[PDB]
Design a protein around this ligand. Structure first.
Ligand SMILES: CC(C)NC(=O)c1c[nH]cn1
Ligand SMILES: CC(C)NC(=O)c1c[nH]cn1
Lengths: 410, 410
């Protein structure tokens, strides 16, 4: 099996329109959460979230192309173009069959579906856009990116709720490991802040309702946590076979050494209280990496600010790491970004890689009063400079679908 | 790399509520296409399609469980339960971590989204169902199946338009080949026959409008073809490591020996006229299988009854197979079933496996007048008994995403 390295990264997040502006936000403990402005929410119990601010799609696409694509596709293409540009890779006839794409989404084109539904109900089916299907389906980030850059390798899309970006990157790494591709662009994108999204998650009572202090709503492992904060954005990595990267003198950020998966097989939305499924997933990833739990320095947690999930993840970390659980640093960047759903795994993989580059554990902001049993190093309030050789990134999604990525300094 | 065999199959299709009723339909050249009855379509240009007739979800689930799930999830669970029952596999503490699920969909819960949109527009966000998100997202077939049967292995969902079921089965086979699972339940499901689906595909001019003769609308490679016929249903296979299957004395249908992928990188909806991407995909699959093109006996074609796609697939088959292109049999079962979108690859994998079991090439019905260059053995009109050692199944999806599965008699 061939070694896989990260040579390019791209992001849109509530903290910035690229990787270095987002990361500056993360290390400063800045919140990206604000009252929502692009719709009127005075009939909703949650009226805030993490928006991408100032996004200009015409930096990436013609206005003609963009008007045919849902926002989640625009955001995925933006992160993907940034990553490819960041990688310095040149696509030619000699390599285009060896370069593929795995960009996923958890919900896809909800906004577009909602707008076409309005036309359909008010004015009948003839008012539906001809670009409705190709501009709304989840695999059109992979499809459009492949067309725009001439990428002829494996071309597909995962949809595994909050685990989407983690699965997208892990399965892309497998394609390269197994020799199906030399390069993959992988990650995820989400834009679910329409009436159906806020209404949907709200009707499930899944969202924080702290409308008086939105920057304080996302508070992973805090005793006053009350549900996640809905956020938008995208993350993409360029994954490359190590000898291919060396040959062309690429800048290498990190090595992607392990990927694990499991299912809880317990409940559609609630994890088991002991986090047995998350424990299996992290062990599977470390076994895939050929690493002992004692070699892990940093975990970028799932940590969504829900009552049951946050404490299940602590339990799983204590089960897997034993005494070393008190030596590693674990934080949730969702404290600042909120929950980017299908993009959360992609942006958190990027933060895990940059934690390795900069030798700094990003903070869990808003962790004022850690709940019963939440006595690990959760990097409360402030970024902590420390030795990081190995970083883990966890994603635990609806349906009990789990994924873990393991990254190493190269 | 470990060998992968098929030990269980399940289906809902326009031709039957299980595999043997569907397959009897296929070998008799029966159409599953009829005028649509469950909605009023006198403002639509297409008023027919392939419905699942007489489906009773209470054969599989409680009425309480079912009311919370979109039809595409009900259909996926039905096919999955059939496959698992057909396999005779017993799930225990000793094996549950080694059994996973990859059931995908191309569009997912369009009907549910449409119904919740109506509530939202008429009566505001408080009218949205609390089960809207978990009952509509694509990965809830994998999630619910894992919960219902206690499956704790890899748990994920592909969404690659018409290639979904092919990718789902190929990537599940990779999980077993690489040792991540001993058993996977894989395939796809679709229910897109709501206003948004018929309206959507109609607005793109993608559908046949032959409302006067619906059973004759789906006519792959015929000079009078005018777009695909929209169909609903699901397909699931139980994939198993060969020594695991032998150990428990499973009945083995076939061996899954190859899987290939490519991207066209050409156009969002139209293939290149020479089918270069489909050619790469079929070569990748045969190279993955360790088979020469001359060993292929039967191809279950993508063959959707569109002007450009049907002839691109002939071109690709002539490029890959050369003189042997005139010795193999190729047919489109979509002539009878119509286009099941994200389930098409799953039901066509099943038909390819049963072509190996029964030594019979299913027919392309309605192939009255083959178009220019469509001079291969397309098994026009009637099933053809013949020697089949090796069968290929092709899927070519929106975004130029391609997949091919290669099956062998075991
Ligand atoms: C979404 C939920 C099932 N996931 C979690 O937050 C979690 C934590 N440990 C295990 N699952
Ligand atoms: C959907 C379309 C792009 N696919 C085809 O029908 C086809 C046939 N050969 C190559 N693609």
């Amino acid at each position: 099996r061939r070694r896989v390295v990260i040579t390019g990264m791209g992001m849109l997040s509530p903290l910035g329109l690229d990787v270095p502006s987002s990361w500056e936000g993360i290390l400063a403990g800045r919140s990206g959460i604000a009252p929502i402005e692009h719709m009127d929410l005075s009939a909703y119990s949650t009226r805030f979230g993490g928006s991408v601010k100032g996004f200009n799609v015409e930096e990436y696409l013609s206005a003609k192309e963009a008007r045919k694509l849902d926002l989640f596709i625009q955001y995925g293409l933006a992160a993907s173009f940034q990553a490819v540009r960041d990688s310095g890779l040149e696509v030619t006839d000699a390599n285009r069959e060896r370069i593929g794409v795995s960009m996923g989404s958890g919900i896809g084109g909800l906004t577009n579906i909602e707008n076409n539904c309005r036309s359909l109900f008010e004015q009948g089916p003839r008012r539906i856009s001809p670009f409705f299907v190709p501009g709304s389906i989840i695999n059109m980030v992979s499809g459009f990116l492949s067309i725009h850059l001439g990428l002829q390798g494996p071309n597909y899309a995962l949809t595994t709720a909050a685990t989407t970006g983690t699965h997208s990157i892990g399965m892309a790494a497998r394609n390269i490991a197994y020799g199906e591709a030399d390069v993959m662009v992988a990650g995820g994108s989400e834009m679910a802040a329409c009436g159906l999204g806020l209404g949907g998650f709200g009707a499930a009572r899944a969202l924080s309702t702290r409308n008086d202090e939105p920057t304080r709503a996302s508070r992973p492992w805090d005793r006053d946590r009350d549900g996640f904060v809905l956020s938008d954005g995208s993350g993409a990595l360029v994954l490359e076979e190590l000898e291919h990267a060396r040959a062309r003198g690429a800048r290498i950020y990190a090595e992607l050494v392990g990927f694990g998966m499991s299912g809880d097989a317990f409940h559609m939305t609630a994890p088991p209280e002991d986090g047995a499924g998350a424990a299996r997933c992290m062990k599977n990833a470390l076994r895939d990496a050929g690493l002992d739990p004692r070699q892990v320095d940093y975990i970028n947690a799932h940590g969504t600010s829900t009552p049951a999930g946050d404490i299940a993840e602590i339990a799983a970390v204590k089960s897997v790491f034993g005494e070393h659980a008190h030596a590693l640093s674990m934080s949730s960047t969702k404290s600042m970004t909120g929950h980017l759903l299908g993009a959360a795994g992609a942006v958190e993989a990027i933060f895990s890689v940059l934690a390795l580059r900069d030798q700094v554990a990003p903070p869990t902001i808003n962790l004022d009063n850690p709940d019963e049993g939440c006595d690990l190093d959760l990097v409360a309030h402030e970024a902590k400079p420390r030795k990081i050789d190995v970083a883990l990134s966890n994603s635990f999604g609806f349906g009990g679908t789990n994924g873990t990525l393991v990254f190493r300094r190269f």
